[PDB]
Amino acid sequence: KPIVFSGAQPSGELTIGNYMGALRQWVNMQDDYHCIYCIVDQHAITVRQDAQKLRKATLDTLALYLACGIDPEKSTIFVQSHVPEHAQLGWALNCYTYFGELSRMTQFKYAENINAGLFDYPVLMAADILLYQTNLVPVGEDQKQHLELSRDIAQRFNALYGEIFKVPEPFIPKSGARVMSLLEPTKKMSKSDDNRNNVIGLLEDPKSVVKKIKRAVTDSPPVVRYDVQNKAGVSNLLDILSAVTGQSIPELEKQFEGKMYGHLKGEVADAVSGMLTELQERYHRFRNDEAFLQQVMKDGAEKASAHASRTLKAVYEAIGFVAKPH
Amino acid sequence: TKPIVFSGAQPSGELTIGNYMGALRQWVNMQDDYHCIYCIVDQHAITVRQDAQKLRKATLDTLALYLACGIDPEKSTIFVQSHVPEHAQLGWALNCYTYFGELSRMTQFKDKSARYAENINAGLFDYPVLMAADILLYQTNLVPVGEDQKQHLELSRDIAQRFNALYGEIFKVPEPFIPKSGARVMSLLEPTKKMSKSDDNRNNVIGLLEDPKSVVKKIKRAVTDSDEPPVVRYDVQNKAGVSNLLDILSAVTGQSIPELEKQFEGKMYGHLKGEVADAVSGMLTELQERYHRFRNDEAFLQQVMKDGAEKASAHASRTLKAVYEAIGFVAKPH
Ligand SMILES: Nc1ncnc2c1ncn2[C@@H]1O[C@H](COP(=O)(O)OC(=O)[C@@H](N)Cc2c[nH]c3ccccc23)[C@@H](O)[C@H]1O
Ligand SMILES: CC1(C)c2c[nH]c3cccc(c23)S[C@H]1C(=O)O
Numbered sequence A: 001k002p003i004v005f006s007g008a009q010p011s012g013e014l015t016i017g018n019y020m021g022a023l024r025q026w027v028n029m030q031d032d033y034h035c036i037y038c039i040v041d042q043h044a045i046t047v048r049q050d051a052q053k054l055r056k057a058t059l060d061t062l063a064l065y066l067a068c069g070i071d072p073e074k075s076t077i078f079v080q081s082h083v084p085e086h087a088q089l090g091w092a093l094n095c096y097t098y099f100g101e102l103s104r105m106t107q108f109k110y111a112e113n114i115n116a117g118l119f120d121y122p123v124l125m126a127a128d129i130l131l132y133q134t135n136l137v138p139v140g141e142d143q144k145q146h147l148e149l150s151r152d153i154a155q156r157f158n159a160l161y162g163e164i165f166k167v168p169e170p171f172i173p174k175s176g177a178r179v180m181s182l183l184e185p186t187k188k189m190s191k192s193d194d195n196r197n198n199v200i201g202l203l204e205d206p207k208s209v210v211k212k213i214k215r216a217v218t219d220s221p222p223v224v225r226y227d228v229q230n231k232a233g234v235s236n237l238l239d240i241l242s243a244v245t246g247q248s249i250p251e252l253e254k255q256f257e258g259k260m261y262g263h264l265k266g267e268v269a270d271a272v273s274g275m276l277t278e279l280q281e282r283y284h285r286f287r288n289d290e291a292f293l294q295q296v297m298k299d300g301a302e303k304a305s306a307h308a309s310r311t312l313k314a315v316y317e318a319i320g321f322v323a324k325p326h
Numbered sequence B: 001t002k003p004i005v006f007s008g009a010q011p012s013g014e015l016t017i018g019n020y021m022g023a024l025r026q027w028v029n030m031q032d033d034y035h036c037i038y039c040i041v042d043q044h045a046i047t048v049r050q051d052a053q054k055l056r057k058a059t060l061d062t063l064a065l066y067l068a069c070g071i072d073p074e075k076s077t078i079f080v081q082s083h084v085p086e087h088a089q090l091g092w093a094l095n096c097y098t099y100f101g102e103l104s105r106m107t108q109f110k111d112k113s114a115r116y117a118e119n120i121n122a123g124l125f126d127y128p129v130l131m132a133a134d135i136l137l138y139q140t141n142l143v144p145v146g147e148d149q150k151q152h153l154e155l156s157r158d159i160a161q162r163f164n165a166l167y168g169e170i171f172k173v174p175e176p177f178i179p180k181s182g183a184r185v186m187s188l189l190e191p192t193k194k195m196s197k198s199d200d201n202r203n204n205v206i207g208l209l210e211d212p213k214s215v216v217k218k219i220k221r222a223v224t225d226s227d228e229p230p231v232v233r234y235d236v237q238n239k240a241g242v243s244n245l246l247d248i249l250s251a252v253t254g255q256s257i258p259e260l261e262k263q264f265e266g267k268m269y270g271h272l273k274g275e276v277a278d279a280v281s282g283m284l285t286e287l288q289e290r291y292h293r294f295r296n297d298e299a300f301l302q303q304v305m306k307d308g309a310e311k312a313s314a315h316a317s318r319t320l321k322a323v324y325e326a327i328g329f330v331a332k333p334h
Helices: A016-027 A051-067 A085-094 A099-103 A116-130 A141-161 A206-214 A232-245 A249-255 A261-287 A290-319 B017-029 B052-068 B086-095 B100-104 B107-115 B122-136 B147-167 B212-220 B240-253 B257-263 B269-295 B298-327
Strands: A003-008 A034-039 A076-079 B004-009 B035-040 B077-080 B142-144 B175-177
Touching: A003 A116, A016 A232, A016 A261, A034 A051, A051 A076, A051 A261, A051 A290, A051 B298, A076 A290, A085 A116, A085 A290, A085 B086, A085 B122, A099 A116, A099 B122, A116 A141, A116 B086, A116 B100, A116 B122, A141 A290, A206 A261, A232 A249, A232 A261, A261 A290, A290 B052, B004 B017, B004 B122, B017 B142, B017 B240, B035 B052, B035 B298, B052 B077, B052 B269, B052 B298, B077 B298, B086 B122, B086 B298, B100 B122, B107 B122, B107 B147, B122 B147, B142 B147, B147 B175, B147 B298, B212 B269, B240 B257, B240 B269, B269 B298
Parallel strands: A003 A034, A034 A076, B004 B035, B004 B142, B035 B077, B142 B175
Antiparallel strands: none
16 A cells, blocks of 8 residues: 655645645545655745744644544654654755756755755655655645656665665646636636735635635626636636535536526635635634644654654665664 | 863774874863763765765774774763764754855865765755754864864854854854864875875875874875975975974874974984884874774774763754754654
8 A cells, every 4th residue: 555745834824725626635545545744844944934933833734634634543644853864864865966956956946045955955855755665745736846856866876775765656646626716717726826815725714705706807798607718717616616515517507597606706605615614613623732733743753753764774774874773 | 061072073084194183183182171072974974975884884993093092982972973863953954044155165065076076966065064063963162173174163153153143042152173283284295285085196195094114104205395405494384294294293292393393403304204204103003003902892882882872862952952942843742
């Protein structure tokens, strides 16, 4: 059964696109794969930010992932800094990563505020993956180059020392749910959009959801019908609704037979907020139970440590370090 | 508590008399005056590709060489860098408080780039940050190094102050301790070039483990100036070779440069190099006898590593906990 590794940014403000696409997809496959979720607080500090905000966003991310259905009895979920092997393999893999490889990274694309954490975080990301003998990494478009570096480092290291690492593969199949930006239905709804009226975050209240749905773009008589060319905005709203409800697009078209665009946005907001209401309720239950979150964090980090230490011990043996006396 | 000293040497290549006069001599001399912590920085060594078997054997060589020079494990903490995970952890975090320009300006990164153009790796680039992490973990007051580490040491003071100004008095700002004499021991056949472990011209280099008979031959052929008449006078600019030999003689005997200038009044360079060779031969002969007694007792080397890494970890983990609290990390549950 394959090992799957995902990193979760504590600063990431997740959206209904993330939840109904990737997260829903992976929540349903936790018995099919050995899923590992790593909240990457070591990657976060490559962007200077308030310390207390970062502490809180780490705990918010953990509760939010648990709210969405990550089950820590099935999956391994942990905080990156709680497992020292990441930094250790991160340093070691530096020595096997070309300087040019890092400088040709587009996500790194100065000498006045580029801290070296921003420059070197692809190697840390490689270390995150290789520690766990990872077979599959679900990567978005802007993470494809980073995944390729990981495979390049792993095969380079393996060529010198043997099958120490598994070469990770991208996880190819996409969720299927189609969620696009509210004001730009040519672009996909993205958690990292600076324009937040483009997205519906998971913790938003029904009154806020009504506001952003109500300002979702539309077209001319008017008719509710799926056409990603002529009626892209209307198509996105049918896609979100179908994503929330499970109704087919042809079914939804007959539901909105003779109804107008306001009733569609009203039905979309009602369904999205309904979904977000049970999600938020679970999120607050987990988020206010400090003993619970401590227990998940402790359990997951120990599960993760067992695998990471095995790998790092193999790396150190191969490289030629004297083993730490036991 | 006494002020704290920290310093490191790589288990790569063979240590030279430059390593002795620039660092190890001062390490030994400081063990009583301060609380001294000495590291074998194997994570720094792999920035230059090593044969794995050699790296492991070289690590135990370096430890025995520390012991043979008088580093005393009952007085100093001695440990191998990779046995203390906190070095890597703080190394990562301090990358975020180091600018890219500071690292691309580094002379060591430029020189090592030209020497190892087939392996210009990111560890070579990031080298100063892990070095800073080594130093700042132990609340270090003093770092005894040769002249060639001075730029590295200044970055770690700058990273220390930068972090502290954000977060409070988390790190001590360290200070260099660089010797007045013997901080940049020069090459024997080329005294305008520093003596380097990695020199292809091995007649330039005095190795601490080299056969004394071969060291004597090399010293007697050291190049000297063409003053007429020849005078044994200390002048590093205009008398590079002669001054380098005086530096080396003084590191073996403990006599001052002026007490050596008087000793060699009315003396010529042949006599000078013969005395240097004789004194260097004797010191290496006694060092190598101690070295073999320590080196062949690998169970004693293992015990030193175990006790040292445990002593190091108690300090390093205390600093790292404070760094993690300050930057905003959720603390690992107990
Ligand atoms: N010709 C010379 N004359 C005088 N001194 C010399 C000469 N050649 C070398 N040295 C000094 O020897 C020490 C060890 O050198 P390394 O190359 O192992 O040195 C190095 O590679 C360090 N980066 C190891 C290190 C890693 N982390 C640290 C933290 C604190 C202090 C030191 C370290 C150094 O003090 C070096 O200046
Ligand atoms: C930064 C990030 C969260 C990350 C760190 N380490 C990883 C290992 C596998 C996949 C990923 C990651 S995704 C990546 C992203 O940019 O989203």
